[PDB]
Amino acid sequence: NPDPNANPNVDPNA
């Protein structure tokens, strides 16, 4: 649901 490309600085697999 979260867009992992909203902010690449946020671990997209946290």
């Epitope: 649901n1 979260p2 867009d3 490309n5 909203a6 902010n7 690449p8 600085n9 946020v10 671990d11 946290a14």
Partner: antibody
Framework: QVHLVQSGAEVKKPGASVKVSCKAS????????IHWVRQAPGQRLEWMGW????????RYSQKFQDRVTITRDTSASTAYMELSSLRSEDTAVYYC??????????????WGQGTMVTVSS | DIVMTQSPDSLAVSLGERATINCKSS????????????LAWYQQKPGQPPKLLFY???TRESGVPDRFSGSGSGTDFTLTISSLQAEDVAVYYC?????????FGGGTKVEIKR
Amino acid sequence: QVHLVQSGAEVKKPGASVKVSCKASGYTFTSYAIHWVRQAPGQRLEWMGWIKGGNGNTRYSQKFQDRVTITRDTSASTAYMELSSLRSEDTAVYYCALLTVITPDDRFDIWGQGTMVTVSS
Amino acid sequence: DIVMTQSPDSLAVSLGERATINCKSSQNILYSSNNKNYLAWYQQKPGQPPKLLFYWASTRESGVPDRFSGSGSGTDFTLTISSLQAEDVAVYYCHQYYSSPLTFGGGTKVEIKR
């Protein structure tokens, strides 16, 4: 220390363009994305776009993609935001920022000092 | 776009009293897979950029005093200052990084009564 330093205050006439620089230091420039954020008077913070220091890929707000271009120069560890076809309502403080870096190994959030841009005839 | 709405727009409490700031998101920003709320709290003093205080709704940044705490879930979130100090006067902003564009709340101005 992770640090972002922006170019100084600007004044432009309507129709012109402005280019603000953001010089990074204290971390590996190619590892993270630098965001640009507008703070207009009495208005909320508005996200403008980001660029990855490494491959230079960008993403723009569909409020600004029409007139904003973000670029970076890794050898200079600097990101740039150019806003064209300026309107007096573009008068605002413009920030660059390493927004919410959340990694297994690193977690921080660092902003440049802001750049005042006034558009006026 | 996800709209971030804060309440109240303004509040004044005496020094050492509790201050409560609310943020509401127009969409759910809790991710059931990891059970994380994709929200940050920022503190902005005049002439300064915003200073992040909380990641993931409730994780304090290093060095944030313990009187600050972030709470809430889903669409409703709260920043609480349990004992307001003179140095806490500022505008507080919530932020979602769940979807694009990144968006911010309208801000809550916090002032001191003395």
